[PDB]
Swiss-Prot record, chains A, B:
Expression by tissue: Widely expressed.
Included stretch of the parent chain: 297 to 559 of 591
Gene that encodes the chain: CTPS1
Annotated protein name in UniProt: CTP synthase 1
Domain Glutamine amidotransferase type-1: from-to ranges: 4-258
Localization in the cell: Cytoplasm, Cytosol
Amino acid sequence: ETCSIALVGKYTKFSDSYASVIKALEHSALAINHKLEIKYIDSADLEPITSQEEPVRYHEAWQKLCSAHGVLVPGGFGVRGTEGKIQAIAWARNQKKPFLGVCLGMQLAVVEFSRNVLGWQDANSTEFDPTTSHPVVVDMPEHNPGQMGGTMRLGKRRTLFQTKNSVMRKLYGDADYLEERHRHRFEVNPVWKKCLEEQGLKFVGQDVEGERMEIVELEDHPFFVGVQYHPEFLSRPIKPSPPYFGLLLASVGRLSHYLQKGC
Amino acid sequence: ETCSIALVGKYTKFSDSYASVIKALEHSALAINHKLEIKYIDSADLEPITSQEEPVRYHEAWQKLCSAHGVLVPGGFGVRGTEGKIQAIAWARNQKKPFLGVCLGMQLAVVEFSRNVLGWQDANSTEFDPTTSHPVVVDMPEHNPGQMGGTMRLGKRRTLFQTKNSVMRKLYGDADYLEERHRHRFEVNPVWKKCLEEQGLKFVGQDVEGERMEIVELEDHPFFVGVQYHPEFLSRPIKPSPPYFGLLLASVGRLSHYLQKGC
């Protein structure tokens, strides 16, 4: 069968911007031996602005979104489509659709959670709103010596698991730590993390310092995870990265059997 | 070209419930020599209940609605889909899409107008809500002698034009009056008609007594009319009835030329 995934984003207008991302998905598709459809949904088309402009595209986008087996909100740049992106996120969370967010997507997912769970509707990313009542996403650059100002976190870095009870950890193979590609500047405000700890939004991965959050796994959800690091760079046809493979498995509704079968 | 019309309704689930209605449309299609698509949109699919249930159908319905060239909200029975029906009406009014309402459709259109123009959001039909703050649609049956209780208005009755400046009148041929099929029980509450007279919702057709309203033409709209009477019964291939022909013409964006050309 053809499993379809809703690529939701900005730069998502078809381009090869996602060539290695789709290729990573292909690695998983080959492993599982299924077919793969990449839907290209401009997140903007998910917004009521579009409804006002061309509601054909508006409803078409959402129709496609629902028809997708899983959804992917990758990182991206620009305030554009943030609303549609978050709407898609909330949609997937409510509908218990396999959700993978990467970087920005993870960041927005946390904001979405705060807004529609903690009620902090004014929660926001300082990346786009400096006047945020609950600065969820905050600029946390690295300040290495010899550098003027901060710098984006980039490179192969080590991420530590905060717990054994982690689906991703299991997918990785019960590793105490993992090393992944990094490319990202904004991080979780710990001021609110602590307000998310009693919540079912659990943060699983952290940098070595134990400060920056890299993995989040929403509890009580078939598949709703977010990562900051970029695994598509390391995924290979032989060794596919697990967040895409796992997403695929969830998109299929195989994942539980998979793990049960023996991972 | 194929001109499509959005049949919005209950009983709209495909059936031949609308065989003479579509046939009337066919009469117009033949006159104009164009092709005709009948979309069958369950008005229920236009409601947020459906969004909650199956948003695929929800967005699909609205996608189809937008893709339609004109819309038809005919009469019908039952409270079911009233919301989606009204939503479609407001949509068409806002989007300036050719709108023809018949009986219930006309009735709901008036309510919609009151709600979203007069702000009388609790305006309603007493047919379904006896506790209505602004009883727009009220039960006004005929009370003929020998009858116990009232009766539905039914039969070929004469309708009088209230004005010369009427698009429909022009389509009819400047007739002082018209005789049409009737089948309907609820009427416009005159208590609010008088509040609609300073409005751009103009009532053009009336029964002989000058009490029951039969034709309404929304001003400043390419085509937004409602009738109580049922012209599809009298439409013939040779002499197609004009509200369907005119609707077609509007759906095409020919109507102004048509009248200009000489009607």
